[PDB]
Curated annotation (Swiss-Prot), chain A:
<comment type="subunit">
    <text>Belongs to the CWC complex (or CEF1-associated complex), a spliceosome sub-complex reminiscent of a late-stage spliceosome composed of the U2, U5 and U6 snRNAs and at least BUD13, BUD31, BRR2, CDC40, CEF1, CLF1, CUS1, CWC2, CWC15, CWC21, CWC22, CWC23, CWC24, CWC25, CWC27, ECM2, HSH155, IST3, ISY1, LEA1, MSL1, NTC20, PRP8, PRP9, PRP11, PRP19, PRP21, PRP22, PRP45, PRP46, SLU7, SMB1, SMD1, SMD2, SMD3, SMX2, SMX3, SNT309, SNU114, SPP2, SYF1, SYF2, RSE1 and YJU2. Interacts with RDS3.</text>
</comment>
<comment type="function">
    <text>Contacts pre-mRNA on both sides of the branch site early in spliceosome assembly.</text>
</comment>
<protein>
    <recommendedName>
        <fullName>U2 snRNP component HSH155</fullName>
    </recommendedName>
</protein>
<feature type="repeat" description="HEAT 6">
    <location>
        <begin position="12"/>
        <end position="49"/>
    </location>
</feature>
<comment type="similarity">
    <text>Belongs to the SF3B1 family.</text>
</comment>
Curated annotation (Swiss-Prot), chain C:
<protein>
    <recommendedName>
        <fullName>Pre-mRNA-splicing factor 8</fullName>
    </recommendedName>
</protein>
<comment type="function">
    <text>Functions as a scaffold that mediates the ordered assembly of spliceosomal proteins and snRNAs. Required for association of BRR2 with the spliceosomal U5 snRNP, and the subsequent assembly of the U4/U6-U5 tri-snRNP complex. Functions as a scaffold that positions spliceosomal U2, U5 and U6 snRNAs at splice sites on pre-mRNA substrates, so that splicing can occur. Interacts with both the 5' and the 3' splice site, as well as the branch region. Has a role in branch site-3' splice site selection. Associates with the branch site-3' splice 3'-exon region. Also has a role in cell cycle.</text>
</comment>
<feature type="region of interest" description="Important for branch point selection">
    <location>
        <begin position="8"/>
        <end position="21"/>
    </location>
</feature>
<comment type="subunit">
    <text>Component of the U4/U6-U5 tri-snRNP complex composed of the U4, U6 and U5 snRNAs and at least PRP3, PRP4, PRP6, PRP8, PRP18, PRP31, PRP38, SNU13, SNU23, SNU66, SNU114, SPP381, SMB1, SMD1, SMD2, SMD3, SMX2, SMX3, LSM2, LSM3, LSM4, LSM5, LSM6, LSM7, LSM8, BRR2 and DIB1.</text>
</comment>
Curated annotation (Swiss-Prot), chain D:
<comment type="subunit">
    <text>Belongs to the CWC complex (or CEF1-associated complex), a spliceosome sub-complex reminiscent of a late-stage spliceosome composed of the U2, U5 and U6 snRNAs and at least BUD13, BUD31, BRR2, CDC40, CEF1, CLF1, CUS1, CWC2, CWC15, CWC21, CWC22, CWC23, CWC24, CWC25, CWC27, ECM2, HSH155, IST3, ISY1, LEA1, MSL1, NTC20, PRP8, PRP9, PRP11, PRP19, PRP21, PRP22, PRP45, PRP46, SLU7, SMB1, SMD1, SMD2, SMD3, SMX2, SMX3, SNT309, SNU114, SPP2, SYF1, SYF2, RSE1 and YJU2. Interacts with CUS2.</text>
</comment>
<comment type="function">
    <text>mRNA splicing factors, PRP9, PRP11, and PRP21, are necessary for addition of the U2 snRNP to the pre-mRNA in an early step of spliceosome assembly.</text>
</comment>
<protein>
    <recommendedName>
        <fullName>Pre-mRNA-splicing factor PRP11</fullName>
    </recommendedName>
</protein>
<feature type="region of interest" description="Disordered">
    <location>
        <begin position="1"/>
        <end position="21"/>
    </location>
</feature>
<comment type="similarity">
    <text>Belongs to the SF3A2 family.</text>
</comment>
UniProtKB/Swiss-Prot annotation, chain E:
<comment type="similarity">
    <text>Belongs to the CWC24 family.</text>
</comment>
<protein>
    <recommendedName>
        <fullName>Pre-mRNA-splicing factor CWC24</fullName>
    </recommendedName>
</protein>
<comment type="function">
    <text>Involved in pre-mRNA splicing.</text>
</comment>
<feature type="zinc finger region" description="RING-type">
    <location>
        <begin position="63"/>
        <end position="101"/>
    </location>
</feature>
<comment type="subunit">
    <text>Belongs to the CWC complex (or CEF1-associated complex), a spliceosome sub-complex reminiscent of a late-stage spliceosome composed of the U2, U5 and U6 snRNAs and at least BUD13, BUD31, BRR2, CDC40, CEF1, CLF1, CUS1, CWC2, CWC15, CWC21, CWC22, CWC23, CWC24, CWC25, CWC27, ECM2, HSH155, IST3, ISY1, LEA1, MSL1, NTC20, PRP8, PRP9, PRP11, PRP19, PRP21, PRP22, PRP45, PRP46, SLU7, SMB1, SMD1, SMD2, SMD3, SMX2, SMX3, SNT309, SNU114, SPP2, SYF1, SYF2, RSE1 and YJU2.</text>
</comment>
Amino acid sequence: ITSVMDLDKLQPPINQILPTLTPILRNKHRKVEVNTIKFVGLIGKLAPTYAPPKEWMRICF
Amino acid sequence: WQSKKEYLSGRSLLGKRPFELPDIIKKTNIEQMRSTLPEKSLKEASRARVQPKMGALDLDYKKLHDVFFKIGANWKPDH
Amino acid sequence: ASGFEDSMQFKKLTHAQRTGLSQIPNRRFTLWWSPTINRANVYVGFLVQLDLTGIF
Amino acid sequence: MNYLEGVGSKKGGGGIASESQFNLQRRKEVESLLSKGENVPYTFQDEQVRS
Amino acid sequence: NQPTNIRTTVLMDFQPDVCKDYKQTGYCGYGDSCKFLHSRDDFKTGWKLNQEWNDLEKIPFKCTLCKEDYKSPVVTNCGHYFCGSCFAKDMKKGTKCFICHKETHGSAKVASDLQKMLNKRKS
Ligand SMILES: [Mg+2]
Ligand SMILES: [Zn+2]
Ligand SMILES: [Zn+2]
Ligand SMILES: [Zn+2]
């Protein structure tokens, strides 16, 4: 939905989505880690400006 | 060849010095910011992953670019 | 809850994480019974309103 | 009233640390024991009498 | 059957129960046991992405050469503006803008659009 639809008009919005994903990266398994890392990297491309840079550093770890 | 020694064997290699950055690069000041030659409790490290801390190097981007391009354009190794 | 407990994590849990009890089932019990457990008819008690809600 | 339990946590950061980090710690201490604590110097350091 | 005649003052509850470690970091030490919310909100697009690694008036009215009113005005391939006497004199020395230092090539338009926007009546 996110890649297809415009970011600005996403309902949740993005700035509320991204901090919900960072604790999901700790979810082990694979289906979650794979599908998440593709979602987080999407936002790195499309909307980098939302989460503050100390949030991107919490993801890099 | 004809040496059973394996080409590189110690006697000279015992005393080889670690590495010296070329002088032009050493101008970029990195030598001071990260001291490699020659600390953090494991608890304090795991606290850094969660916090984290920003602006560790304080390197200047304009200076780095010029060393390779503007100032060190024609810099070529000595020998 | 009997389903998925095994695979949470293994080595990683901190003492509280591993030993302590989850508040999550009690919260489920007090949501389901909320309108009795929270009712205005009470003998003695004082009204408060939550910050941004209209819930007393 | 969950104080009945008796576990707790400090309010700082994110605890356990990563298995790779434990090995680095454990292989330094093992080389401290067997070494009997001596500092074996680097070859370039320009010579604390050694054992 | 709450009594008929009573006014009870609402007392706001201002304390949110948000867990301050999980709000900031996204990791809470206590885990599923934590007595608080864990809800994780973040601010509002504060940051502007500028990379160091890689009715505005832009028209000065008095000249950059005369420092006087534009007379016989001049346009370049920029938005530069000069007097007919101005621009001709700069090329006697300078190759480029008195401002950009881009290539003018001595190219100068009659700038009447200036006199327009320097009219009170525009065009
Ligand atoms: Mg305590
Ligand atoms: Zn918590
Ligand atoms: Zn002039
Ligand atoms: Zn110009």
